[PDB]
Design an enzyme around this catalytic site. Structure first.
Site, PDB file in Angstrom:
ATOM      1  N   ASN A 143       0.357  -2.211  -2.350  1.00 30.79           N
ATOM      2  CA  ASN A 143       0.091  -1.447  -1.269  1.00 30.79           C
ATOM      3  C   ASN A 143      -0.286  -2.462   0.171  1.00 30.79           C
ATOM      4  OD1 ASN A 143       0.001   1.025  -2.402  1.00 30.79           O
ATOM      5  ND2 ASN A 143      -2.043   1.094  -3.179  1.00 30.79           N
ATOM      6  N   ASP A 160      -1.077   3.099   1.945  1.00 34.68           N
ATOM      7  CA  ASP A 160      -1.923   3.693   0.950  1.00 34.68           C
ATOM      8  C   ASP A 160      -3.046   4.380   1.009  1.00 34.68           C
ATOM      9  OD1 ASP A 160      -2.046   5.525  -1.069  1.00 34.68           O
ATOM     10  OD2 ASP A 160      -1.271   4.058  -2.670  1.00 34.68           O
ATOM     11  N   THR A 179      -6.561   1.540  -9.713  1.00 35.68           N
ATOM     12  CA  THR A 179      -5.693   0.820 -10.714  1.00 35.68           C
ATOM     13  C   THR A 179      -6.785  -0.135 -11.411  1.00 35.68           C
ATOM     14  OG1 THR A 179      -3.809   0.865  -9.624  1.00 35.68           O
ATOM     15  CG2 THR A 179      -4.001  -0.872 -11.097  1.00 35.68           C
TER      16      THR A 179
END
Ligand SMILES: Oc1ccc(/C=C/c2cc(O)cc(O)c2)cc1
Length: 276
Positions: A143, A160, A179
């Site tokens: 990102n 993002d 994540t």
């Protein structure tokens, strides 16, 4: 809030696909009226109230509302928003030099100078966001986009905002979760979250930049998450033997379980490894 419902194809032509994920695809595009180029992010809408596919209107509107606030050299900007029955289409600034993730896969490891050149820009972008009480919640090398990867010191922009939230009470309690390799312990533990979670992610990014290795990565997602919660990481000598103790200090003061004891964005900019 409603968006432009004319056909986006009446105003833009699309080209190369830049990437895709679970609920969205991003395509390079060109505005017909100006010749200027953008990245069109097509976000799939939820088709019923109780569905799990697509993205809820509330979540789309949050991402758009946050993006509309942003104007800073190190953060992506939003140009226009369209929608139809199937998608919301964000016309985003085009940053065409690829992911920091892919740049790192080539060099395999950065010098401290190269790492700090990237990190200073990431910190500047996050400083802007945190000053606006915006938590990103999904910081990671994928990102971070480079403007041009063929220069000695690539410039970057943070992208993002699909997990980003305004933190107007100092914390949000919403089951936000990114994540596993990059989430802070308070995310793993489903605790109230604030700007501090981003600072943990910055610590993970820094460790990766300097070593090419991920500090908490296990063989499964559950192991990674357990490692994060336990702060199960160490500086392997094979990777860090020629890394300065000050660089390790910077990481160590970010990978702190208690969010109140972790460095803030302002602390990170004054830390002796970063401060000129
Ligand atoms: O200017 C830009 C704006 C957005 C993007 C997004 C790229 C992208 C990359 C991925 O690996 C997955 C994905 O779903 C999207 C790229 C450039």
């Amino acid at each position: 809030t409603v968006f432009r419902q004319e056909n986006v194809d009446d105003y833009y032509d699309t080209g190369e696909e830049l990437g895709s994920g679970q609920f969205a695809v991003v395509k390079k595009c060109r505005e017909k009226s100006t010749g200027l180029q953008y990245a069109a992010k097509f976000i799939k809408k939820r088709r019923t109230k109780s569905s799990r596919r697509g993205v809820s209107r509330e979540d789309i509107e949050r991402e758009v509302s946050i993006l509309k606030e942003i104007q800073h050299p190190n953060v992506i900007t939003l140009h226009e928003v369209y929608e139809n029955k199937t998608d919301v289409i964000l016309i985003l600034e085009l940053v065409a030099g690829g992911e920091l993730f892919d740049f790192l896969a080539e060099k395999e490891s950065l010098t401290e100078e190269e790492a700090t050149e990237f990190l200073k820009q990431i910190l500047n972008g996050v400083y802007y966001l945190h000053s606006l009480q915006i938590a990103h919640f999904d910081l990671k090398p994928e990102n971070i986009m480079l403007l041009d990867r063929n220069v000695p010191k690539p410039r970057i922009k943070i992208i993002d905002f699909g997990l980003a939230h305004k933190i107007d009470f100092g914390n949000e309690f919403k089951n936000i979760f990114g994540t596993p390799e990059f989430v802070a312990p308070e995310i793993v533990n489903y605790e109230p979250l604030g700007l501090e979670a981003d600072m943990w992610s910055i610590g993970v990014i820094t460790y990766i930049l300097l070593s090419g290795a991920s500090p908490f990565l296990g063989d499964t997602k559950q192991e990674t998450l357990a490692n994060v919660s336990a702060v199960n990481y160490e500086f392997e000598d094979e990777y860090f033997s020629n890394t300065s103790a000050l660089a390790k200090d910077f990481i160590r003061r970010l990978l702190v379980k208690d969010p109140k004891k972790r460095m803030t964005i302002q602390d990170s900019l004054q830390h002796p490894w970063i401060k000129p």
